[PDB]
Design a protein around this ligand. Structure first.
Ligand SMILES: [Mg+2]
Ligand SMILES: [Mg+2]
Ligand SMILES: [Mg+2]
Ligand SMILES: [Mg+2]
Ligand SMILES: [Mg+2]
Ligand SMILES: [Mg+2]
Ligand SMILES: [Mg+2]
Ligand SMILES: [Mg+2]
Ligand SMILES: [Mg+2]
Ligand SMILES: [Mg+2]
Ligand SMILES: [Mg+2]
Ligand SMILES: [Mg+2]
Ligand SMILES: [Mg+2]
Ligand SMILES: [Mg+2]
Ligand SMILES: [Mg+2]
Ligand SMILES: [Mg+2]
Ligand SMILES: [Mg+2]
Ligand SMILES: [Mg+2]
Ligand SMILES: [Mg+2]
Ligand SMILES: [Mg+2]
Ligand SMILES: [Mg+2]
Ligand SMILES: [Mg+2]
Ligand SMILES: [Mg+2]
Ligand SMILES: [Mg+2]
Ligand SMILES: [Mg+2]
Ligand SMILES: [Zn+2]
Lengths: 97, 51, 73, 98, 165
RNA sequence: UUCGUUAAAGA
RNA sequence: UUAAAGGAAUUGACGGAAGGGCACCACCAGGAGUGGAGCCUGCGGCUUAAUUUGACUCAACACGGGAAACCUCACCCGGCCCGGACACGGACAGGAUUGACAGAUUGAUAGCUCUUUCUCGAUUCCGUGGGUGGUGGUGCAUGGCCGUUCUUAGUUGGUGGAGCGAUUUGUCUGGUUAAUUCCGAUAACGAACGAGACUCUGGCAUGCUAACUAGUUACGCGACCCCCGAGCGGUAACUUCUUAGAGGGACAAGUGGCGUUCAGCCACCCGAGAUUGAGCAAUAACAGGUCUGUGAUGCCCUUAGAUGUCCGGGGCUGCACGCGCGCUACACUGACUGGCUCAGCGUGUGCCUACCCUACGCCGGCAGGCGCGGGUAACCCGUUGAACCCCAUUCGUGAUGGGGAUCGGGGAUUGCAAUUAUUCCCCAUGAACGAGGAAUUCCCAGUAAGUGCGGGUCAUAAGCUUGCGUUGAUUAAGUCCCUGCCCU
């Protein structure tokens, strides 16, 4: 049983990771590590201008999609107990049994 | 009536933009439909930063 | 540019379609003051031939709603 | 050019059930997608809603392809003329708020 | 049942954010519009509109917010009342530069000439705790050529990273 | 080494 | 006849005035080239019914991400429809407004029109006002955005000196620096924007944090040569390799010299680094470009035989010519054949309206087909088994086997349709080109160049562009002579 935290901002990612580990230390569950996935980056290069005057000057837009995985083997009742957490909207939660 | 021949399943004429249907300028295959004229204005709103 | 499109008139000013018929239409014929006689041919049973009569032609018959066309020698 | 008799009363029934109509720019020339709520795709919807936006009944807004039609208090006051046909029923916009 | 990639779902969500935000600044230009906050929740999709004048959002008897709820739910794919809207009154009117430009639009429409409107918004922003503003109004003003009128008071940082926040 | 003209107004 | 003419003086602006600085978009010492030949792609002139158009020094000329078979398309040719909203009003058909089979005409089975006559039913048809649309015109009316000045370093206020005042000093003789960056001299003192500082990335490291969607040591399953406890790959702990969070780490600090107490340069060491590359980037201008980006818009034209939108062709490609960015070669440091061996960004599915990425087996020589499987992704392509490079053979100074342009035949694939444009493969024809005149472009270290891959349009799809990797130079680290710019 694993839980994937897919995040847009790394600061809120680390905050919700610290909150989850702080809420998971006190229970009798073997908490595995928040595995650092490699950061996804969607680079887009843009002409900067509707009409072609001047030098070939290009916008270079990026994103930094971050991803963490934890492994918490438990029955589904304990999973639904852990599931109810108020979260910042920059982080998405998925579960996989 | 025959208003719609040319079934338009491919090519430049099929790609219609989400913003202003600027099918002359190209529309990128990024899970996205912009112009490059309006993606500049709306990239910081949809989540793209320059850095 | 300054391109001037002028009416060279290859074709004349043509007329559009105008729907014109007689004054009233008497489909049914009264015989012996109460018996109804039918002159025109009905439409076959394809959810069209309830009250729809077909068009007269030299060798064809044509329906109005669902455009069924029948031919006979 | 004659819309079927079910068409106008059905789109007015949808507008009376909701109060918000939604369409896109795609009137049949690149492609023919039908409307997600009704039978006629876009053209009869625009022809039915232009008479409502031109009589000062329903406001108009646009979101990048899509026409969103906006119900007015005076819009309901002139939809009373449509409410001649059913009994007096308030839609789910003005009656109550959860 | 259906699913898409993480590399495309986030940019689809961002296009949804920009679509909703810019359509609400189109149609809610009457009241003071600041911005939106959307919480991703699979039970009830909560959309929070931060507005300066919340009276037009609340409507007369809770009508306009339910109408905009129907606007969202009858295209964006959320049946049975999945999307729920909530307004937030913004107390600091002089903090939101979007609200300042939005009020400056309606002041420049109905008379209220450019010099007096620019000094009024500079005095209001300087009164509302700000360190420094810069109101620039450009266009055809009492003539043919476009006169570029700039007005600036206080302190302003133009270059570097922290200009954005 | 040479290169002419552009009014009336418009802050 | 006129309401000014004029005088010093202040600040801009402008000079075909001077002085001092800065710049590899200037030069020196060089490298790679272009201009020479062929081809690719834009531009001009022709031609054309049309070869749609904007842009013309840097600051236009593979730029409009502009690679067009139809779409894109705005240009010619011919032909449908009104989406003509809405108000008053004509007939209102004793309820007849819109749709079409058969034949002629038209590419058409457009009912476009005609002969023929069935159907839908108060939404109609027509007129008068009004509205819509346009990739129509006007970027010298405009918004926004970009480019350029200018990535050069330059601008401003408070208090106080000078002047009656506009104003001026501060903001400067000199030194240094990428910098108005500081030190200094000082009627100026503390200050502000800009430059730095800021953010991202690269380089170093901890047994700091931790991983079956990433690996390692042993061990077991288990193959193989000697057979001698060895070696090479296939299938219980720790993050060193892979990934990413925080913190550390570099500041010209240490020494000696050059310099005024200075500001700061030069050589060495410890160090991974004696500092890498980008983003943002002021006050203010151009009467720079874009109305062909829009439901951003002012004014003018049209709205029924349309400058609206479709349909079917042609066109932007069209050629006595000139110009620009590029690609291929002019070979032996090389071409061909065979073997060997190494990557890094990043992309990929039932999409908020049409769609992939590709393993395995068989067939075909190849371009390709068939069946089956995985992947919505550190999982599957994939331990991206790339090219260049390295080893062996052939070629032997011959426009040769280098060059592959032009040209004929055939075979595959997308697409509804490929011929006066697709694309790929096989055979064959085998040109100029012998290192390029005048002039000219870029460049200071993982840098130029050689070389391949990934994204953008994509279906077919790169010789363009954006990024990533492999090998990896020469010679400067200085200057105001040429050019351009700034300041006084
Ligand atoms: Mg251009
Ligand atoms: Mg396409
Ligand atoms: Mg384009
Ligand atoms: Mg302006
Ligand atoms: Mg203005
Ligand atoms: Mg203006
Ligand atoms: Mg003007
Ligand atoms: Mg003059
Ligand atoms: Mg004088
Ligand atoms: Mg060329
Ligand atoms: Mg040209
Ligand atoms: Mg020509
Ligand atoms: Mg046009
Ligand atoms: Mg104008
Ligand atoms: Mg005085
Ligand atoms: Mg001064
Ligand atoms: Mg690693
Ligand atoms: Mg500036
Ligand atoms: Mg409007
Ligand atoms: Mg035209
Ligand atoms: Mg070329
Ligand atoms: Mg597509
Ligand atoms: Mg030939
Ligand atoms: Mg080429
Ligand atoms: Mg030069
Ligand atoms: Zn658009």
């Amino acid at each position: 049983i694993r839980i994937t935290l897919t995040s847009r901002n790394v600061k809120s990612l680390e905050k919700v990771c610290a909150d989850l580990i702080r809420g998971a230390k006190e229970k009798n569950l073997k908490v595995k590590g928040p595995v650092r996935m490699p950061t996804k980056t969607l680079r887009i290069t843009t002409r900067k201008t509707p009409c072609g005057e001047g030098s070939k000057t290009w916008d270079r837009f990026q994103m930094r999609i971050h991803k963490r995985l934890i492994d918490l083997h438990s029955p589904s009742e304990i999973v639904k107990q852990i599931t109810s957490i108020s979260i910042e909207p920059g982080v998405e939660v998925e579960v996989t049994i | 009536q025959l208003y719609w021949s040319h079934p338009r399943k491919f090519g430049q004429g099929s790609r219609s933009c989400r913003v202003c249907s600027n099918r002359h300028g190209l529309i990128r295959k990024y899970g996205l439909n912009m112009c490059r004229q309006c993606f500049r204005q709306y990239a910081k709103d949809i989540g793209f930063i320059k850095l | 540019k300054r391109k001037k499109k002028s009416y060279t008139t290859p074709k004349k000013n043509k007329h559009k379609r105008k729907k014109v018929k007689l004054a009233v239409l008497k489909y049914y014929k009264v015989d012996e003051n109460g018996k109804i006689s039918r002159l025109r041919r009905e439409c076959p049973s394809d959810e069209c031939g309830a009250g729809v009569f077909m068009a007269s032609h030299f060798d064809r018959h044509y329906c109005g709603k669902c455009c069924l066309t029948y031919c006979f020698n | 050019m004659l819309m079927p008799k079910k068409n106008r009363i059905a789109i007015y029934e949808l507008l009376f059930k909701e109060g918000v109509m939604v369409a896109k720019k795609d009137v049949h020339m690149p492609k023919h997608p039908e409307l997600a709520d009704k039978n006629v795709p876009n053209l009869h919807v625009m022809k039915a809603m232009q008479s409502l936006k031109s009589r000062g009944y329903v406001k108009e807004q646009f979101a990048w392809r899509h026409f969103y039609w906006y119900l007015t208090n005076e819009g309901i006051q002139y939809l009373r003329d449509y409410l001649h046909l059913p009994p007096e029923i308030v839609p789910a916009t003005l009656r109550r708020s959860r | 049942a259906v699913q898409i990639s993480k590399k495309r779902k986030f940019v689809a969500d961002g296009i949804f954010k920009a679509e909703l935000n810019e359509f609400l600044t189109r149609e809610l230009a009457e009241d003071g519009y600041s911005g939106v906050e959307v919480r991703v929740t699979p039970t009830r999709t909560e959309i929070i509109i931060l507005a300066t004048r919340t009276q037009n959002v609340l409507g007369e008897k809770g009508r306009r917010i339910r109408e905009l709820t129907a606007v969202v739910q009858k295209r964006f794919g959320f049946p049975e009342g999945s999307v729920e809207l909530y307004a937030e009154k913004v107390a600091t009117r002089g903090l939101c530069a979007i609200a300042q430009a939005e009020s400056l639009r309606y002041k420049l429409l109905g008379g209220l000439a450019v010099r007096r409107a620019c000094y009024g918004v500079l005095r209001f922003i300087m009164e509302s705790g700000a360190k420094g503003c810069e109101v620039v109004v450009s266009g055809k003003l009492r003539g043919q050529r476009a006169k570029s009128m700039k007005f600036v008071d206080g302190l302003m940082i133009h270059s570097g990273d922290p200009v954005n926040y």
